[PDB]
Amino acid sequence: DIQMTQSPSSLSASVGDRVTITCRASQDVNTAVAWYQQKPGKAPKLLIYSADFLYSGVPSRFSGSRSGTDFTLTISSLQPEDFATYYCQQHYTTPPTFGQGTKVEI
Protein backbone atom coordinates (compact mmCIF):
# COMPACT_ATOMS: atom_id res chain seq x y z
CA ASP A 1 0.00 0.00 0.00
CA ILE A 2 2.39 2.82 1.25
CA GLN A 3 5.10 3.59 -1.36
CA MET A 4 8.52 4.79 -0.08
CA THR A 5 10.42 6.86 -2.67
CA GLN A 6 14.14 7.03 -2.02
CA SER A 7 16.54 9.43 -3.82
CA PRO A 8 19.08 9.24 -5.22
CA SER A 9 19.38 5.57 -6.41
CA SER A 10 23.16 5.77 -6.02
CA LEU A 11 25.86 8.32 -5.32
CA SER A 12 29.62 8.61 -5.06
CA ALA A 13 31.52 10.58 -2.38
CA SER A 14 34.93 10.77 -0.67
CA VAL A 15 35.96 9.85 2.87
CA GLY A 16 35.08 12.88 5.05
CA ASP A 17 32.18 14.12 2.87
CA ARG A 18 28.67 14.72 4.23
CA VAL A 19 25.99 12.82 2.25
CA THR A 20 22.21 13.05 2.55
CA ILE A 21 19.61 10.55 1.31
CA THR A 22 15.93 11.47 1.09
CA CYS A 23 12.83 9.30 1.51
CA ARG A 24 9.23 10.40 0.76
CA ALA A 25 6.17 8.38 1.83
CA SER A 26 3.03 8.31 -0.37
CA GLN A 27 0.87 8.84 2.78
CA ASP A 28 1.15 9.90 6.43
CA VAL A 29 3.43 7.53 8.42
CA ASN A 30 3.67 9.72 11.54
CA THR A 31 7.25 9.48 12.87
CA ALA A 32 7.57 5.78 11.96
CA VAL A 33 10.47 5.60 9.45
CA ALA A 34 13.55 3.39 9.78
CA TRP A 35 16.90 3.41 7.96
CA TYR A 36 19.04 0.35 7.34
CA GLN A 37 22.62 -0.13 6.22
CA GLN A 38 23.48 -3.15 4.12
CA LYS A 39 27.11 -3.85 3.34
CA PRO A 40 27.83 -6.31 0.50
CA GLY A 41 27.84 -9.86 1.90
CA LYS A 42 26.11 -8.75 5.13
CA ALA A 43 22.62 -8.63 6.63
CA PRO A 44 20.85 -5.23 6.79
CA LYS A 45 21.47 -3.41 10.06
CA LEU A 46 19.13 -0.95 11.72
CA LEU A 47 20.60 2.60 11.99
CA ILE A 48 17.59 4.81 12.72
CA TYR A 49 14.07 4.10 14.02
CA SER A 50 11.03 6.47 14.27
CA ALA A 51 12.57 8.95 11.77
CA ASP A 52 15.26 10.36 14.11
CA PHE A 53 16.18 7.88 16.88
CA LEU A 54 19.71 6.44 16.73
CA TYR A 55 19.79 2.69 17.37
CA SER A 56 21.98 1.99 20.42
CA GLY A 57 25.59 1.30 19.22
CA VAL A 58 25.29 3.06 15.86
CA PRO A 59 27.94 5.78 15.19
CA SER A 60 26.64 9.36 15.84
CA ARG A 61 27.76 10.60 12.38
CA PHE A 62 24.53 8.84 11.20
CA SER A 63 21.43 10.98 11.85
CA GLY A 64 17.82 10.90 10.68
CA SER A 65 15.42 13.86 10.22
CA ARG A 66 11.76 14.34 9.31
CA SER A 67 9.89 17.23 7.67
CA GLY A 68 6.24 16.08 7.24
CA THR A 69 6.19 13.14 4.78
CA ASP A 70 9.89 13.92 3.89
CA PHE A 71 12.62 11.96 5.72
CA THR A 72 16.41 12.33 5.45
CA LEU A 73 19.41 10.29 6.50
CA THR A 74 22.65 12.18 6.85
CA ILE A 75 26.16 10.79 7.19
CA SER A 76 28.10 13.81 8.47
CA SER A 77 31.63 12.45 7.82
CA LEU A 78 31.84 9.44 5.51
CA GLN A 79 34.21 6.71 6.71
CA PRO A 80 35.67 3.90 4.50
CA GLU A 81 33.40 1.29 6.16
CA ASP A 82 30.22 3.32 5.29
CA PHE A 83 30.34 2.09 1.62
CA ALA A 84 26.97 0.30 1.51
CA THR A 85 23.40 0.37 0.28
CA TYR A 86 21.03 2.33 2.53
CA TYR A 87 17.28 1.64 2.70
CA CYS A 88 14.39 3.53 4.24
CA GLN A 89 11.26 1.69 5.50
CA GLN A 90 7.94 2.84 6.96
CA HIS A 91 6.99 0.98 10.14
CA TYR A 92 3.58 2.70 10.43
CA THR A 93 1.20 0.17 8.91
CA THR A 94 1.35 -3.31 7.30
CA PRO A 95 2.94 -4.26 5.07
CA PRO A 96 6.23 -2.57 6.12
CA THR A 97 7.51 -1.19 2.78
CA PHE A 98 11.09 -0.31 1.79
CA GLY A 99 12.61 2.37 -0.44
CA GLN A 100 14.43 1.16 -3.58
CA GLY A 101 17.80 1.65 -1.79
CA THR A 102 20.62 4.18 -2.28
CA LYS A 103 24.02 2.69 -3.12
CA VAL A 104 26.87 4.79 -1.69
CA GLU A 105 30.25 4.29 -3.40
CA ILE A 106 33.65 5.55 -2.21
Binding site: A43, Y49, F98
Partner: protein, 119 residues
Protein backbone atom coordinates in the same frame (compact mmCIF):
# COMPACT_ATOMS: atom_id res chain seq x y z
CA UNK B 1 22.76 -11.65 23.47
CA UNK B 2 19.86 -11.40 20.96
CA UNK B 3 20.53 -13.23 17.71
CA UNK B 4 18.69 -14.84 14.75
CA UNK B 5 20.28 -17.72 12.80
CA UNK B 6 18.77 -18.86 9.48
CA UNK B 7 19.35 -22.13 7.67
CA UNK B 8 17.82 -24.11 4.82
CA UNK B 9 18.96 -22.21 1.74
CA UNK B 10 20.25 -23.81 -1.38
CA UNK B 11 19.55 -24.98 -4.86
CA UNK B 12 15.98 -26.04 -5.68
CA UNK B 13 14.23 -26.94 -8.93
CA UNK B 14 11.42 -24.68 -10.24
CA UNK B 15 8.06 -25.91 -8.87
CA UNK B 16 9.87 -27.47 -5.88
CA UNK B 17 9.60 -26.68 -2.19
CA UNK B 18 12.00 -25.61 0.51
CA UNK B 19 11.71 -24.73 4.17
CA UNK B 20 13.83 -22.02 5.78
CA UNK B 21 14.33 -21.91 9.52
CA UNK B 22 14.98 -18.89 11.71
CA UNK B 23 16.24 -19.80 15.20
CA UNK B 24 16.23 -17.10 17.90
CA UNK B 25 18.58 -16.68 20.93
CA UNK B 26 18.34 -14.22 23.89
CA UNK B 27 14.63 -13.47 23.42
CA UNK B 28 11.44 -15.52 22.85
CA UNK B 29 9.82 -15.35 19.43
CA UNK B 30 6.35 -15.53 21.04
CA UNK B 31 7.03 -12.06 22.59
CA UNK B 32 7.26 -10.44 19.10
CA UNK B 33 6.62 -10.87 15.39
CA UNK B 34 9.07 -12.62 13.06
CA UNK B 35 9.36 -11.23 9.53
CA UNK B 36 10.92 -12.58 6.39
CA UNK B 37 12.54 -10.13 3.96
CA UNK B 38 14.28 -11.06 0.73
CA UNK B 39 16.89 -9.43 -1.47
CA UNK B 40 16.52 -10.54 -5.08
CA UNK B 41 19.25 -9.20 -7.45
CA UNK B 42 18.16 -5.72 -8.65
CA UNK B 43 14.98 -5.55 -6.46
CA UNK B 44 16.34 -4.09 -3.20
CA UNK B 45 14.72 -5.37 -0.01
CA UNK B 46 11.24 -6.87 -0.30
CA UNK B 47 9.05 -7.69 2.69
CA UNK B 48 7.70 -11.25 2.22
CA UNK B 49 5.73 -12.34 5.32
CA UNK B 50 5.31 -12.14 9.07
CA UNK B 51 4.07 -14.33 11.88
CA UNK B 52 2.90 -13.59 15.42
CA UNK B 53 4.09 -16.87 17.07
CA UNK B 54 1.69 -16.65 20.05
CA UNK B 55 -1.31 -17.52 17.84
CA UNK B 56 0.40 -18.25 14.47
CA UNK B 57 -1.42 -15.30 12.80
CA UNK B 58 0.29 -14.59 9.44
CA UNK B 59 0.45 -11.93 6.70
CA UNK B 60 1.98 -12.40 3.22
CA UNK B 61 3.09 -10.09 0.41
CA UNK B 62 1.08 -10.47 -2.84
CA UNK B 63 4.23 -11.82 -4.56
CA UNK B 64 4.30 -15.00 -2.37
CA UNK B 65 0.74 -15.21 -1.01
CA UNK B 66 -0.88 -18.59 -1.82
CA UNK B 67 2.56 -20.26 -2.21
CA UNK B 68 4.56 -19.51 0.96
CA UNK B 69 3.40 -20.10 4.54
CA UNK B 70 5.00 -19.27 7.87
CA UNK B 71 4.92 -21.40 11.00
CA UNK B 72 6.69 -21.36 14.37
CA UNK B 73 7.71 -23.82 17.05
CA UNK B 74 7.83 -21.75 20.24
CA UNK B 75 9.46 -24.60 22.26
CA UNK B 76 12.43 -24.63 19.78
CA UNK B 77 12.22 -20.81 19.57
CA UNK B 78 12.25 -21.14 15.76
CA UNK B 79 10.15 -19.80 12.89
CA UNK B 80 9.90 -21.43 9.46
CA UNK B 81 9.16 -20.18 5.97
CA UNK B 82 7.63 -22.96 3.87
CA UNK B 83 8.13 -22.16 0.20
CA UNK B 84 6.00 -24.00 -2.39
CA UNK B 85 5.75 -23.77 -6.20
CA UNK B 86 9.10 -22.04 -6.34
CA UNK B 87 9.78 -19.82 -9.41
CA UNK B 88 12.81 -18.03 -10.88
CA UNK B 89 11.74 -14.69 -9.30
CA UNK B 90 12.01 -16.30 -5.82
CA UNK B 91 15.82 -16.53 -6.21
CA UNK B 92 17.09 -14.22 -3.44
CA UNK B 93 18.86 -13.96 -0.14
CA UNK B 94 16.21 -14.55 2.54
CA UNK B 95 16.49 -12.81 5.88
CA UNK B 96 14.48 -13.19 8.99
CA UNK B 97 14.08 -10.34 11.44
CA UNK B 98 12.18 -9.44 14.57
CA UNK B 99 9.75 -6.56 14.98
CA UNK B 100 11.37 -5.15 18.15
CA UNK B 101 9.06 -3.58 20.81
CA UNK B 102 6.12 -4.92 18.69
CA UNK B 103 7.21 -2.46 15.90
CA UNK B 104 8.51 0.54 17.87
CA UNK B 105 12.10 -0.49 17.04
CA UNK B 106 11.30 -1.58 13.46
CA UNK B 107 13.47 -4.55 12.46
CA UNK B 108 16.11 -4.33 15.13
CA UNK B 109 17.53 -7.91 14.92
CA UNK B 110 18.32 -9.68 11.61
CA UNK B 111 19.50 -13.11 10.65
CA UNK B 112 22.68 -13.53 8.57
CA UNK B 113 20.65 -14.39 5.44
CA UNK B 114 20.43 -17.58 3.42
CA UNK B 115 20.55 -17.82 -0.39
CA UNK B 116 17.76 -19.63 -2.24
CA UNK B 117 18.56 -20.38 -5.88
CA UNK B 118 15.76 -21.63 -8.10
CA UNK B 119 17.47 -23.66 -10.84
Amino acid sequence: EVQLVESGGGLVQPGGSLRLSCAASGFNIDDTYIHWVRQAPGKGLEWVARIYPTNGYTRYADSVKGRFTISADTSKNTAYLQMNSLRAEDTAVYYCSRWGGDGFYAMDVWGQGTLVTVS
